[PDB]
Design a protein around this nucleic acid. Structure first.
Ligand SMILES: [Zn+2]
Length: 84
RNA sequence: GGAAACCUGAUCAUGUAGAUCGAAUGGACUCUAAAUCCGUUCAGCCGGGUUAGAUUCCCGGGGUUUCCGC
């Protein structure tokens, strides 16, 4: 709740993209105001460590459109995302 | 010094999962090419409020533009 994006990812261990797709985070590291994230499916992204970004809002949702196939998100992980 | 408008890839929009463009990446296709297409990924400048719920509304900071100032 109004927390930086690194806190939300570090808590859930998951990510939700602009399309509502859930990915499992394999690695993430902070540097200055930036975050470098590697998903289990292989994607690499670099985002701002903001309290107001779309990913920060999306992690604060209790909805999702689909899960990443290659990330193999478990029903347990999905449940832990739905029940923050 | 003060006032108003806007906000960081671009343009626009916006209290109830923003959109279009652009870029990165994989694939299809192709001649291991071009063109074309598809999948995946990328946002709210910062800090507090209000709210069931905030990029959106309020206050403050910062930046830009414009206007009014000894
Ligand atoms: Zn994934």
């Amino acid at each position: 709740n109004n927390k930086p994006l690194n806190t939300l990812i570090s808590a859930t261990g998951l990510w939700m993209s602009r399309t509502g797709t859930i990915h499992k985070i394999k690695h993430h590291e902070v540097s200055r105001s930036k975050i470098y994230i590697e998903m289990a499916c292989g994607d690499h992204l670099v985002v701002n460590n903001s309290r107001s970004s779309r990913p920060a809002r999306a992690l604060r949702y209790h909805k999702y459109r689909k899960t990443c196939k290659r990330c193999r998100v478990s029903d347990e992980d999905l449940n832990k995302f739905l029940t923050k």
